[PDB]
């Protein structure tokens, strides 16, 4: 009983897995190495790295099993561990994105607490959650009995593959909505092409790398041509190799370690380019309290001025009790007196943080330039 | 060529469709009737109502066509318009929930023209997608022709049903993440039992009535028993009939016109029950500015006092530069002079809006009771 000589696609898969493991070995090594990199966000990156390394090891071991080994059960356990690793990688991506969202959101409500209630509950639910879906394909969902349809990848039952695809589509939807929220929040703290490209390649790469296999899984059949599955399984390993370059090496702290081994932002730009060192502000009380303008304009060395709390309440009325309420005259009067006193105090430019200020106040009403977002 | 006598499941479906149409007719008529009900969020409810009415009309017309008409083209266009209506219904539900979430996210900027543009774009997009995945695919690419291996519902191709199922699962993921966010953000104005029950029941209502079928969409083929299809389609009509009771028919002004035709809430009510009319607050600057605490306690007639701006900055240091920074002594120092001056001014009780205050402040340190969230 000699082992048939594998076709070239087998050695292509072997090379892909080999470079995947080689690429991730260094990243897991450095992640686990330096004692300083024990931040809560680093644990998720480590989880992703070890999951992908496990995937590569499983792939090369399976190729070995199909190369002068001639075994039966080891092939089954290797396909099981491969499914384990892929589900773990998808869970690591979801956990990373949810951590990033919760990080960038908490800087507005100003309420941060706990590290064991949140990080470990989801870190243990991605590897632990994959236990069931990595033990089902071996326990009682095999193809050797004969009753199972054994749809696409031999041996895997139709039901198990369908369940996996449903889970994948669910997590894709959650990821899409999360990225929409993060883009909406980060746009405010900003041109259009750069803003889109900030988060447009990662989601496109994820989709273009993982969609074809699941689409085939749904549409396929047992008697499908054999080259189709081999053609569609490559993007999964390609994403496995791409992901650590884009989610781990981009962080500049690891870059420093290696080198040792080896709408408001643009407004601030415009203000700094005009040579003005002092700006006055008219906006809502929440906006001034939020502290965004001070940090953004201090990043370029520009100082902002907000009137006193009584004139803050005056601007409150002028915007909402004034322009917004239909009493345009009161709004323009209050805004004009506030702008006048601010200009007298030494401001060379005035910023109208909301549209209502621009509605009743124009350039001709001020000696200094009037600039709006 | 006589028409075979339908099975009793057919008249069951007819009864369900008639009830759906009758229930939705009144609500759509009332919504379109009163000129005062032209709010931006009323348009989405109207769209959902018209979609459900269209679905009911399509179902009853299809039963009619399969009864003593014996026509082929009419049945085809009727099943097409049925798919049209169901897709429109699910899209309208998603639009309603996204509108609610954006409305509850920010309250100041919700009432403007921006929400008008958003509403118009959402309505156009949902009905255009209904056009693109409804009548247009069904009046082509069908089964009443050469071999297409049409799937469970006669006549519908396998590929069309798979595409519909994929879209449904993506929409389900979006809905799940939205409801998680809304449940997170409403459990700060809390009592909690009512909110958690609502946000766990209205989700399951749509989750358990539309997913007997989309799973059968995949695990099945033409050579399938006919009992398994006529049973899983009933929950869709049941959800169609249940929908205009949950999202609509629950607000109060609709009730009035019908009759004419026919964690902080808990603390605030606890303080109110104790008989205290005056409370003092220690929390972050953003929290005191945000206007939540005073609004909630004024809902019960309780007055909250916040320290002056200098003492607010002192509390800022005591929380962050103090307890949070590791200099616990400075934090407790600043917090306890703050509590002392507030108590001397007439505070009958003190609230610690952050855990940091409670860490270094205990009940024995003040004469008045100390209450924490």
Domain boundaries, chain B: 8-261, 265-371
Tokens of A88: 């773990």
Pairing state between β B350-352 and B370-371: parallel
d(CA A29, CA A17): 18
Burial B175-208 (b: 16+ CB within 10 A, else e): bbbbbebbeeeeeebeeeeebeeebeeebebbee
d(CA A216, CA A116): 40
Report yes or no: A87 and A128 within 8 Å, Cβ to Cβ. no
CA A151 to each of CA A13, A159, A222, A328, B210: distance values in angstroms, whole numbers, following the listed order: 21, 9, 5, 70, 26
Sign of CA dihedral B51, B107, A288, B336: negative
- Residue B276: left if φ>0, alpha if ψ -120 to 50, beta else—which one? beta
Report yes or no: B302 and B279 within 8 Å, Cβ to Cβ. yes
d(CA B181, CA A105): 12
Report yes or no: B337 and B326 within 8 Å, Cβ to Cβ. no
Architecture of domain A8-261: Up-down Bundle (1.20)
Give the CA count within 13 Å in the CB-facing half-sphere of A314. Answer: 16
Helix (H, G, I), strand (E, B) or coil at A35: coil
Q: A264-371 belongs to which CATH class?
A: alpha beta
CA B347 to each of CA A148, B153, B287, B316, B351: distance values in angstroms, whole numbers, following the listed order: 73, 70, 19, 20, 10
Residue B138 DSSP symbol: H
End-to-end, the C-alpha distance of chain B in Å comes to 76
Residue B354: which of B275, B259, B285, B262 has the closest Cα? Answer: B285
Helix (H, G, I), strand (E, B) or coil at B334: helix
Sign of CA dihedral B30, B31, B33, B38: positive
B324 appears as a binding residue in the annotation: yes
Question: For the residues of A270-299, what is the DSSP string, one character each?
Answer: HHHHTT--EEEEE--HHHHHHTHHHHHHHT
d(CA B274, CA B279): 11
Question: For the residues of A208-243, what is the DSSP string, one character each?
Answer: HHHHHHHHHHHH--TT--HHHHHHHHHHHHHHHHHH
* Alpha-carbon A219 to chain mean position: 30
Residue A34: which residues within 8 A CB-CB, separation 6 or more? A257
Residue B349: which residues within 8 A CB-CB, separation 6 or more? B271, B274, B276, B278, B279, B280, B368, B369, B370, B371
Q: Which helix (H) or strand (E) holds A188?
A: helix A158-188
Q: Give every strand in the sheet of B303-305, ordered side by side.
A: B303-305, B278-282, B350-352, B370-371
Q: Which helix (H) or strand (E) holds A312?
A: helix A309-316
Tokens of B146: 């050469």
Q: Does domain B265-371 have CATH number 3.40.50.1860?
A: yes
- B 152-191 near A (Cβ less than 8 A): 158-159, 162, 165-166, 169-174, 176-178
Report yes or no: A161 and A217 within 8 Å, Cβ to Cβ. yes
Sign of CA dihedral B2, B6, B11, B17: negative
Residue A247: which of A100, A45, A31 has the closest Cα? Answer: A45
What angle do the packed helices B158-186 and B192-207 form, to 10 degrees? Answer: 180
Helices (H), chain B: 8-33, 40-65, 73-105, 114-133, 135-138, 158-186, 192-207, 213-216, 227-232, 234-246, 252-261, 265-274, 285-290, 292-298, 309-316, 328-344, 355-360
- What is the CB neighbour count within 10 angstroms for residue A37? 18
Backbone angles phi, psi at B62, to 5 degrees: -65, -45
Q: Between chains, do A218 and B218 touch, taking CB under 8 Å as contact?
A: yes
The answer to whether the peptide bond before residue B155 is cis (omega within 30 degrees of 0) is: yes
Residue B47: which of B207, B244, B289 has the closest Cα? Answer: B244
Q: Which residue of A has its CA nearest to B177?
A: A174
Report yes or no: A342 and A318 within 8 Å, Cβ to Cβ. no
d(CA A75, CA A70): 9
- What is the CB neighbour count within 10 angstroms for residue B299? 12
Residue B115: which of B35, B39, B32 has the closest Cα? Answer: B39
Residue B180: which of A199, A184, A181 has the closest Cα? Answer: A181
A284 close contact with B: CB closer than 8 A = yes
Report yes or no: A285 and A257 within 8 Å, Cβ to Cβ. no
Same fold, A8-261 and A264-371: no
Cβ contacts (< 8 Å) between A178 and chain B: which residues?
177
Residue B68: which of B4, B144, B154 has the closest Cα? Answer: B4
**For testing contact with chain A, the best of B109, B149, B169 (most A CBs within 10 A):** B169
**For testing contact with chain B, the best of A174, A354, A355 (most B CBs within 10 A):** A174
d(CA B88, CA B92): 6
Resolution of the structure, angstroms: 3.7
Residue A44: which residues within 8 A CB-CB, separation 6 or more? A92, A95, A96, A99, A123
């Amino acid at each position: 009983a000699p082992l048939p000589s594998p076709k070239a696609w087998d050695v292509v898969l072997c090379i892909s897995g080999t470079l995947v493991s080689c690429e991730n070995a260094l990243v897991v090594a450095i992640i686990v190495g330096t004692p300083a990199f024990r931040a809560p966000m680093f644990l998720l990156v480590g989880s992703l790295a070890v999951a992908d390394l496990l995937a590569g090891l499983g792939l090369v071991l399976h190729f070995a099993a199909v190369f002068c080994i001639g075994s039966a059960e080891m092939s089954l356990v290797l396909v099981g561990v491969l499914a384990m690793a892929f589900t773990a990688s998808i869970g690591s991506l979801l956990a990373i994105t949810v951590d990033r969202y919760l990080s960038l959101y908490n800087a507005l409500t100003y309420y941060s607490e706990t590290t064991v209630t949140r990080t470990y509950v989801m870190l243990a639910l991605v590897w632990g959650g994959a236990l069931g879906l990595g033990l089902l394909p071996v326990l009682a969902w095999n193809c050797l009995d004969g009753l199972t349809t054994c749809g696409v990848v031999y041996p895997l039952s139709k039901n198990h593959l369908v369940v996996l695809a449903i889970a994948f589509f669910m997590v894709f939807g959650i990821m899409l909505q999360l990225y929409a929220q993060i883009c909406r929040i980060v746009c405010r703290h900003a041109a259009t092409r750069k803003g889109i490209a900030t988060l447009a390649v990662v989601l496109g790469a994820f989709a273009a790398c993982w969609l074809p296999f699941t689409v085939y899984c749904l549409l396929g059949d047992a008697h499908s041509p054999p080259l189709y599955t081999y053609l569609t399984l490559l993007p999964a390993t390609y994403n496995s190799m791409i992901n650590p370059i884009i989610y781990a090496f981009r962080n500049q702290d690891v870059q420093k370690v290696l080198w040792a081994v080896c709408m408001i932002e643009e407004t601030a730009k415009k203000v700094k380019e005009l040579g003005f060192k002092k700006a006055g502000l008219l906006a809502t009380t929440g906006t001034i309290v939020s502290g965004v303008y001070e940090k953004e304009f201090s990043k370029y060395g520009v100082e902002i001025m907000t009137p006193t709390e009584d004139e803050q309440k005056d601007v409150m009325r002028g915007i909402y009790e004034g322009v917004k309420a239909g009493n345009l005259k009161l709004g323009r009067e209050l805004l004009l007196k506030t702008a006048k006193i601010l200009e007298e105090r030494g401001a060379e430019c005035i910023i109208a943080g909301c549209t209502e200020v621009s509605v009743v106040l124009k350039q001709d009403d001020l000696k200094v330039p009037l600039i709006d977002p």
